[PDB]
């Protein structure tokens, strides 16, 4: 089993397993379902106005509570100082 | 009281012999019969052959 998609032109040998090809699932008509609603239909409404500017970072829980706002901010600052996914740094000024 | 010099005043130095002998001139050379390298007569190599029989 090869965990990645084969490149263009490769021929997988027998026995080698390949991740499945993407395909659309089942398909139904619109007149068969009875409750159909458009997403974000109301444009003239006034309740959808942002309470924070569009360039503010989202520091909040999934439910909306701010119990760990400062902890999330500290985690983001620590990740900016040194991310865990940081690969091999190329600059001539390395920490060690 | 000096003023800017035109390109023709600059090239007058080339007409002289002091400019040509310093820049535009070649070397008379030959191949060292021992080292097979280009060589000018009068100067030699650091080599026990080229120091005894200096070609």
């Amino acid at each position: 089993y090869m965990p990645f998609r084969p490149f263009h032109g490769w021929t997988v040998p027998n026995g080698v397993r390949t991740p499945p090809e993407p395909t659309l699932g089942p398909t139904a008509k619109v007149e068969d379902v009875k409750d159909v609603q458009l997403a974000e239909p109301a444009v003239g409404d006034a309740s959808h106005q942002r309470k924070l500017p569009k360039h503010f970072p989202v520091v909040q829980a999934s439910d909306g509570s701010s119990l760990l706002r400062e902890e999330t901010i500290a985690c983001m600052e620590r990740e900016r100082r040194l991310p865990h996914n940081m690969g091999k740094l190329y600059s001539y000024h390395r920490p060690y | 009281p000096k003023r800017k010099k035109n390109p023709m005043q600059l090239r007058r130095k080339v007409y002289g012999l002091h400019f040509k002998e310093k820049y535009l001139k070649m070397e008379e050379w030959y191949y060292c019969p021992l080292c097979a390298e280009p060589k000018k007569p009068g100067e030699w190599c650091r080599r026990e052959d080229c120091r005894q029989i200096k070609p």
């Binding site: 829980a61 902890e71 996914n85 091999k88 740094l89 390395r94 060690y96 | -």
Partner: protein, 97 residues
């Protein structure tokens, strides 16, 4: 003893093996059903694991030329998320009390 220092170091790094990425982390929906004693127990577990992971990351940063990037870096993020979820649960209970 040396057994207390062997837990600061990853065993897979000592055996020159690939450290696998764990399954997940302690979510709030699961931590809500734990008592305070079990919460602080798993908190100290996460603390020891985080100490080991920080030691590994420091070692790789010290030797970044010889050793490449630290393998499986998502463990630090998982530990941080688990500790934050524990703190969330403890804060909720403290506010109720």
């Amino acid at each position: 003893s040396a057994a207390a220092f062997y837990e600061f170091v990853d065993n897979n790094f000592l055996n020159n093996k690939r450290p696998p990425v764990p399954g997940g982390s302690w979510t709030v929906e699961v931590l809500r059903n734990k008592s305070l004693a079990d919460l602080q127990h798993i908190w100290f577990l996460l603390l020891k694991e985080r100490n080991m992971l920080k030691s590994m990351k420091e070692h790789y940063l010290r030797h970044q030329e010889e050793l490449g990037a630290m393998p499986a870096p998502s463990r630090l993020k998982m530990i941080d998320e688990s500790m934050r979820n524990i703190k969330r649960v403890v804060k909720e209970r403290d506010e109720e009390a």
